[PDB]
Amino acid sequence: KVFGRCELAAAMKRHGLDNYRGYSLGNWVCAAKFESNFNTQATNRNTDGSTDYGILQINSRWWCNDGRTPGSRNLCNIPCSALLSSDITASVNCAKKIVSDGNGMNAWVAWRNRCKGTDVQAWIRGCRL
Known about the structure:
- InterPro entries: Glyco_hydro_22, Glyco_hydro_22_CS, Glyco_hydro_22_lys, Lysozyme-like_dom_sf.
- Lysozymes have primarily a bacteriolytic function; those in tissues and body fluids are associated with the monocyte-macrophage system and enhance the activity of immunoagents. Has bacteriolytic activity against M.luteus.
- The chain has helices at about 5-15, 25-35, 90-100, 110-115; strands at about 45, 50-55, 60.
- The chain is globular, with a radius of gyration of 14 Å.
- By secondary structure, the protein is mainly α.
- The protein has a 3-stranded antiparallel beta sheet with strand order 1-2-3.
- The protein has a single domain, classed as Lysozyme.
């Protein structure tokens, strides 16, 4: 499923991502925009052989299990395909584990490079929330 900007902000808000670990809702919505382009079925294979999954492009090496990434941990204890659901619940739960880890949202490159320091609130401008 491809989300609307505001449809997503709302879903993320009810799922408790708004202001989670200090990161206001705009940050999350933007990260979503540039990681996956609001598309839940997005996948990207990396050079190290791992693959990134879903709305927030979560990586097979540390966080889930796709059965083809050697030496992986599965720190969110899910199959990696569960992150491609139109229900964003698993993506969201696993995002909270990642963000709480140590590097905050810097764990996401697209955020770090395309959102960090920007007026991220533009991303929730004019949504019923």
